[PDB]
C-alpha cells in the first residue's frame, strides 16, 4: 500500500479495500483471487485451469464455502500444517501461488507461509512394545525438548497418558510432531494377508483420498472427510487391506458395529476366524496371531467399572501393540473420555472417518493433535453431479401456530415452551399431508423427532411404527427389516438413535417435525440417510428433505442456525409457506375446535417352609 489514491467509495470498505495492488494482463487466465490481509481465496469454477487448481488449492486451503459458481477458500495455520506434511515446501507453494494468483501474494501472506512451512519435519513420535519414544533425527532438539517444563538420533521415553499433553506442547512449541508409519520395513508386528476381491471397485474420489494418505508411501495419521454415502467404509477397508496388519474399528453405536463387519466381510477377503466383535452381547477375542476388533468407544473408553469378561479383553488390547485404528464418526473422539481411547490404545497409524467435521463447541480443532491433520475433503456437489450420491430438494415448511396454542406460548416458561410448540396442530396437518402425498408417490419416508413424547404422540394417533431409545435391538431390527422389504409398510418414525452411521438404501423422503435445538451436525447427518438412495441415478429422481418449523417461535432461530452447515456445502433451503391441495384432503388431525382444545388441555396438563403353605 504505497501511493494509492483512495476512492470516494473507499469509506464503505473498513480497511478491507485491497485495490492498492495492481492486476497483470494475464488476469483472464489466472483463476485465483487472494486477499492480502484475511488470507481468503476466491476461485473461479468457470475458467481454464479450474480443475488444475481445484486439487492444489484444497490441499493448502480449507474450504469455508463452495457454492455453485464462486468457490471460497481460506488459508490457516492448521491448513498449512496439513499441506506441508505431504512433500510441500514454501518455494513450491510460492511459485505455484504466483503462477495462479490474479493479485500478487502480499508480503503478509508471504510472511505467513514462511513461518509455518519451515517447522515441519524435525521431530517424530515412535512406538515400540507399547513404549512411546519421542525420537529426533538431530541432537540439537534435546536441548529444547528435555528442558521443556511440561515434559517429564537420541530417543527418550514419555508416559502414555502424557501423550495428550506433549502433542499440545508440540503445537505450542515451534516444532509439531508428525506420525509416519513405515509398514514396508516393519516386520516385528505380525502381518494380516488380505486383499480386495475382484468384484470390488474403487471410485476415483476414494482413490484420491487414499493417495493423499499414502502419498510418500508411509501410512499417515489424519482425517478423511467424505459426504454421507460416499463409501467411507470401503476407504477404511482399503486402508486396512493395504497395510496388512492388526486393525481395529471404533463406532459410537451398536447396530453400526454389525454394519461395519458386514461390509468388511463382503468387500475384502478376511476370513471370519480373524474377526472378533467386542460389544455388550459377545466379548470373545481372537487368539490368532493377528485380526480385527470392531468395537465401540463406550467399551474402550470405560475406566471405572469393567467386569471379568471385559477385563480380559482390555488386557488383550493393551498388551499387544496394534498397527492401525479406524475411528468411524470421528467427530465425537475429542470428547472428555472418548479421547482416552486414542492414548490408551497403542497404534502406529490412526484414521478418522466422519461425514461432518463440525461440532457446537470449539473442540473441533483439537482433532489435529488427537489423530492428525485433515488429509482430503470431497465436495458434496461434485459427487452429486457425478452420480455417486443422490440429489436432495431441501425444503423448510412454515407452519403458523393456531391462536389458542400461541396464547399459552407467551406465558409458558421456556423449558415447557419446547413441548408446547412441538405438537402444534398445524404441524400435524403438514406432517400427515406430506406423508400421505409421498406415500402415494411410492416413497420410503423417515420421520425424525428428538422429543420422545412427541414421537409417541405422532405414532399412536397415526398408527405407524416408532423407534426410540428404550426399544431393544431385536425389535428395532424387525421394524427396520419390515420397513425395507415389505410393501405394506413404507414409513417409519425414528429418533436420535438412528441419526448416524445407519444405512437405509431405500429411504428417499425425510421429515423432521422437531429436533435437537442448535445442533448442526444432526441436521447434516440426518440428511445423509436419504443421500443413500439406491435409485440415485434414474432420470428425474430427487430426494426430499423437509424441516417443519413453527412460525413466530424460537424454532426459527434454531432452524436457521442448524442448517448453516448445509448451505456452506452447497444445499439451498426452499421456504414453503403453503402446501397446495392440502385443504381437499379428506381428514386432518385436530380439525374441529373441540379436538384442538382437548389436545391443548392434555399437553398443558403434562406438567419358612411351614409358613409358606398359609400364604
Amino acid at each position: 500500500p504505497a501511493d494509492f489514491v483512495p476512492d470516494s467509495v473507499s469509506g464503505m470498505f473498513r480497511s478491507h479495500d485491497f485495490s492498492y495492488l495492481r492486476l497483470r494482463p494475464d488476469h483472464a487466465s489466472r483463476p485465483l483471487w487472494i486477499s492480502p490481509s484475511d488470507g481468503r481465496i476466491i476461485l473461479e469454477s468457470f475458467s481454464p485451469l479450474a480443475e488444475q487448481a481445484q486439487d492444489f488449492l484444497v490441499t493448502i486451503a480449507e474450504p469455508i464455502s463452495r457454492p455453485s459458481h464462486i468457490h471460497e477458500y481460506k488459508i490457516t495455520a492448521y491448513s498449512l500444517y496439513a499441506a506441508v506434511s505431504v512433500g510441500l515446501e514454501t518455494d513450491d507453494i510460492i511459485s505455484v501461488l504466483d503462477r495462479l494468483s490474479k493479485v500478487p501474494v502480499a508480503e503478509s501472506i508471504i510472511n505467513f507461509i514462511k513461518g509455518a512451512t519451515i517447522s515441519y519435519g524435525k521431530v517424530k513420535l515412535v512406538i515400540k512394545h507399547n513404549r512411546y519414544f519421542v525420537e529426533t533425527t538431530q541432537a540439537d532438539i534435546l536441548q529444547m525438548l528435555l528442558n521443556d517444563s511440561v515434559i517429564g538420533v537420541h530417543s527418550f521415553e514419555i508416559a502414555n497418558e502424557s501423550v495428550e499433553v506433549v502433542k499440545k506442547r508440540c503445537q505450542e512449541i515451534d516444532y509439531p510432531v508428525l506420525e509416519e508409519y513405515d509398514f514396508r520395513n516393519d516386520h516385528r508386528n505380525p502381518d494380516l494377508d488380505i486383499d480386495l476381491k475382484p468384484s470390488t471397485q474403487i471410485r476415483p474420489y476414494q482413490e484420491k483420498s487414499l493417495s493423499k494418505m499414502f502419498g510418500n508411501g508411509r501410512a499417515r495419521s489424519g482425517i478423511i472427510v467424505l459426504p454421507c454415502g460416499a463409501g467411507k467404509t470401503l476407504v477404511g477397508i482399503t486402508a486396512a487391506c493395504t497395510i496388512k496388519k492388526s486393525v481395529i474399528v471404533l463406532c459410537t453405536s451398536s447396530v453400526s458395529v454389525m454394519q461395519w463387519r458386514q461390509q468388511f466381510l463382503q468387500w475384502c477377503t478376511l476370513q471370519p476366524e480373524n474377526c472378533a466383535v467386542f460389544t455388550s452381547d459377545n466379548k470373545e477375542m481372537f487368539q490368532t496371531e493377528s485380526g480385527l476388533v470392531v468395537s465401540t468407544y463406550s467399551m474402550v473408553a470405560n475406566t471405572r467399572n469393567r467386569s471379568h469378561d471385559s477385563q480380559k479383553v482390555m488386557d488383550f488390547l493393551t498388551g499387544r501393540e496394534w498397527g492401525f485404528i479406524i475411528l468411524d464418526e470421528v467427530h465425537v473422539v475429542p470428547a472428555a473420555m472418548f479421547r482416552r481411547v486414542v492414548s490408551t490404545i497403542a497404534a502406529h497409524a490412526k484414521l478418522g472417518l466422519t461425514a461432518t467435521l463440525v461440532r457446537e463447541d470449539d473442540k473441533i480443532g483439537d482433532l489435529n493433535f488427537l489423530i492428525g491433520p485433515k488429509l482430503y475433503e470431497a465436495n458434496w456437489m461434485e459427487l452429486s453431479q457425478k452420480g455417486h450420491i443422490a440429489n436432495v430438494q431441501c425444503a423448510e415448511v412454515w407452519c403458523p401456530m393456531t391462536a389458542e396454542f400461541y396464547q399459552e406460548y407467551l406465558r409458558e416458561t421456556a423449558r415447557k415452551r419446547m413441548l408446547l410448540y412441538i405438537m402444534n396442530p398445524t404441524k400435524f396437518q403438514a406432517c400427515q399431508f406430506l406423508i400421505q402425498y409421498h406415500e402415494r408417490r411410492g416413497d420410503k419416508i423417515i420421520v425424525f423427532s428428538d422429543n420422545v413424547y412427541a414421537l409417541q404422540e405422532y405414532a399412536l394417533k397415526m398408527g405407524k411404527p416408532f423407534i426410540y431409545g428404550s426399544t431393544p435391538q431385536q425389535e428395532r431390527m424387525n421394524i427396520l427389516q419390515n420397513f425395507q422389504y415389505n410393501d405394506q409398510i413404507n414409513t417409519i418414525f425414528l429418533s436420535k438413535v438412528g441419526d448416524t452411521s445407519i444405512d437405509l438404501p431405500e429411504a428417499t423422503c425425510l421429515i423432521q417435525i422437531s429436533s435437537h435445538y442448535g445442533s448442526r451436525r444432526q441436521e447434516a447427518q440426518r440428511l445423509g440417510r436419504i443421500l443413500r438412495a439406491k435409485r440415485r441415478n434414474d432420470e428425474g429422481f430427487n430426494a426430499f428433505f423437509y424441516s417443519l418449523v413453527s412460525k413466530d417461535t424460537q424454532e426459527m432461530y434454531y432452524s436457521t442456525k442448524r442448517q448453516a452447515f448445509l448451505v456452506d456445502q452447497g444445499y439451498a433451503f426452499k421456504v414453503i409457506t403453503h402446501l397446495h391441495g392440502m385443504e381437499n384432503i379428506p381428514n386432518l388431525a385436530y380439525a374441529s375446535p373441540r379436538e384442538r382444545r382437548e389436545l391443548l388441555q392434555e399437553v398443558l396438563l403434562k406438567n419358612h417352609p411351614l409358613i409358606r403353605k398359609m400364604y
Binding site: 485451469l49 488444475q52 486439487d55 499414502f214 502419498g215 493395504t242
Partner: protein, 374 residues
C-alpha cells in the same frame, strides 16, 4: 505388489505451465486451393428424388440429440425447404422403412408444402422393427417409373442400421436399378455396410464417393446440404431432348373461381397458355393438358449451375496492389506480412475476404466482370 496410492501423487498442477497472423492466412490459402478446381460440369437440373428414411429399432439410439429418429426427421424438414428453393422445377418423394416394410408417405410431386406435412406427421410415431433396403428400393423403383426420360432419377437413403433383412435377393434389385438408370446415394450413421457400398458404387458407374458416413452432428448437416445441388451426368448416358412447357400469366380477378387442380375456390391463379385452366401455384404440371407451367424466375435459378463463377486466386504480397479498398464493398484491407486481397482473373479486380465468400455463395456474378465493358 504395491498399489498406485503408494507410488506418488498425480500433481495435476505440474501439467499446466505458464507468425500467428500468417497461420490464419495459410489455412485460408490452402482452403482456396481445394475449391480452385471448378469446371462447367454438365448437371441434370430437372431431378426426381425419392427420399428414403430409416425408422427402425437402430434409430432409437441416443447417439444424436435427442435421438436419431428425431434429428433425421428434423433435418429432413430442413432438406425439403432447401431442396425445392434451389430446384424449383424438380419433384420429390418420401419413403420410410418400418417393421421390415416400405411405407409410402409422400407421392412424387412438386409441392414442397405437401412433403413438409408428411414429415411432420412422421415425427410423432415411434420407430420400431427391422429395416429392409430391398422393400424400399423396390418401392422407389416403382415410384420413379412414371417419370420422363429427361429427368434424373435419384434416391437418397438415410441408413442407420448395420444389418438388413430382405425377402428376396438384393443383388437382383441392384441390377434392376442400374438397368433403370436410377442413382442411389446413401448416408450411413454408424459404419460402412457391404451391400450399401456395392449399391452406391455399381449404381453410380463405379464411383465410391456417394456412400458417406458422418462423424458428428455438424458433419451430418453438411452431408444433407450437399445433396441439394444437382448431380453431374455421365458422358455416355445421353438423354438430350426438348421438353414442352409454357409460361402462364398471372391474373387478378374480383371474384373467386374454382381451381382446376383442387376444385377449390381461389381468388387469383395462373392461366395456362394451352387450355386456359387456372392453377393455384407454380411450378406444377397443368391438371388438364399435362403441360408443365413455370415462370422465368424458376429457370433463372439454375443458370449458376451451368455457368459457375471461376474461383478467385490469392495474390502474393510480392507484387503491388491496385487499390486500398474493396472494389465491391470498399472495406479497407488490414495491413496485418501477408495480404488478404482476392483477385478475379477475368476482370483483375481486388475483392475482400468477406465479398469473396458472399459472391460465390449468395450471388453468382462477379461485380467487377459485369462493370467491365468489352
Amino acid at each position: 505388489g504395491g498399489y498406485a496410492w503408494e507410488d506418488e501423487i498425480k500433481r495435476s498442477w505440474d501439467l499446466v505451465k505458464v507468425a500467428s497472423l500468417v497461420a490464419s492466412i495459410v489455412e485460408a490459402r490452402k482452403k482456396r486451393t481445394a475449391k480452385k478446381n471448378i469446371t462447367p460440369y454438365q448437371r441434370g437440373i430437372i431431378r426426381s428424388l425419392i427420399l428414403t428414411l430409416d425408422c427402425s429399432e437402430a434409430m432409437l439410439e441416443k447417439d444424436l440429440r435427442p435421438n436419431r429418429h428425431a434429428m433425421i426427421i428434423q433435418y429432413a424438414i430442413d432438406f425439403v425447404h432447401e431442396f425445392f428453393d434451389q430446384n424449383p422445377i424438380s419433384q420429390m418423394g418420401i419413403i420410410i422403412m418400418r417393421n421390415g416394410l416400405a411405407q409410402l408417405v409422400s407421392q412424387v410431386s412438386g409441392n414442397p408444402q405437401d412433403h413438409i406435412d408428411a414429415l411432420k406427421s412422421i415425427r410423432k410415431q415411434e420407430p420400431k422393427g427391422n429395416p429392409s433396403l430391398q422393400n424400399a428400393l423396390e418401392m422407389a423403383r416403382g415410384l420413379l417409373l412414371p417419370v420422363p426420360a429427361h429427368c434424373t432419377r435419384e434416391v437418397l437413403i438415410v441408413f442407420g442400421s448395420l444389418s438388413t433383412t430382405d425377402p428376396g435377393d438384393i443383388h437382383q434389385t441392384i441390377d434392376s436399378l442400374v438397368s433403370e438408370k436410377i442413382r442411389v446415394k446413401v448416408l450411413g450413421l454408424s459404419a460402412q455396410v457391404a451391400i450399401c457400398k456395392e449399391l452406391c458404387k455399381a449404381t453410380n458407374y463405379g464411383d465410391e464417393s456417394f456412400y458417406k458416413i458422418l462423424l458428428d452432428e455438424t458433419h451430418l448437416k453438411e452431408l444433407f446440404n450437399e445433396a441439394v445441388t444437382p448431380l453431374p451426368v455421365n458422358k455416355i448416358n445421353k438423354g438430350f431432348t426438348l421438353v414442352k412447357m409454357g409460361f402462364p400469366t398471372r391474373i387478378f380477378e374480383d371474384t373467386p373461381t374454382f381451381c382446376s387442380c383442387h376444385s377449390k375456390l381461389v381468388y387469383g391463379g395462373y392461366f395456362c397458355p394451352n387450355c386456359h385452366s387456372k392453377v393455384c401455384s407454380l411450378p406444377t404440371v397443368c391438371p388438364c393438358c399435362d403441360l408443365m407451367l413455370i415462370l422465368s424466375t424458376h429457370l433463372a435459378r439454375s443458370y449458376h449451375h451451368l455457368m459457375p463463377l471461376k474461383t478467385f486466386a490469392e495474390v502474393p504480397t510480392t507484387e503491388k496492389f491496385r487499390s486500398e479498398d474493396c472494389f465491391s464493398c470498399q472495406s479497407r484491407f488490414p495491413i496485418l506480412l501477408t495480404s488478404s486481397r482476392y483477385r478475379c482473373e477475368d476482370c483483375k479486380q481486388e475483392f475482400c475476404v468477406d465479398c469473396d465468400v458472399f459472391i460465390h455463395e449468395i450471388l453468382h456474378n462477379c461485380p467487377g466482370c459485369e462493370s467491365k465493358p468489352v
